[PDB]
Amino acid sequence: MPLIKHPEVKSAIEGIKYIAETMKSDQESNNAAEEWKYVAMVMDHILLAVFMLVCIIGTLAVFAGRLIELNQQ
Amino acid sequence: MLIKHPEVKSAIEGIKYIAETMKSDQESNNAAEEWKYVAMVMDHILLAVFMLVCIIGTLAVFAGRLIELNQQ
């Protein structure tokens, strides 16, 4: 992560400026949204690794002692 | 079912590009909507087909014995 100033031309010019500033603010807000999205993706990756590790650890440690004891006796 | 500044020429080309972009989007949407129409037609046919089969199979399962019991 010539001078043709007229009440309808000025509206068009001002509205074109408004359109540009509108998509400027939209781009800024969108980028601020992708920042949080990147954050959520990073926690997704970290917790994927953590949860697979805990799944392996729970599949092992619950059954480890009684399996090695049966291997020995 | 004569004002040849680069900025002005770039603005002209950008407006043209905007129009061609929206045209291409409309052209893609038309064929997407054609496929949607085909799927909608298939759903209208299959609704009637499935309700008909729902009635017909139930009747075929049960009437063969219910009519025999009515005759008995």
């Binding site: 074109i16 | 603005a11 950008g14």
Partner: peptide, 23 residues
């Protein structure tokens, strides 16, 4: 003339935004 330059820059900006979204 400055008023024309400002709207020219605005039009260029809204063209570049569309090019960004198409990439």
């Amino acid at each position: 003339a400055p008023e024309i330059r400002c709207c020219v820059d605005a039009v260029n900006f809204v063209a570049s935004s569309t090019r960004d979204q198409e990439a």
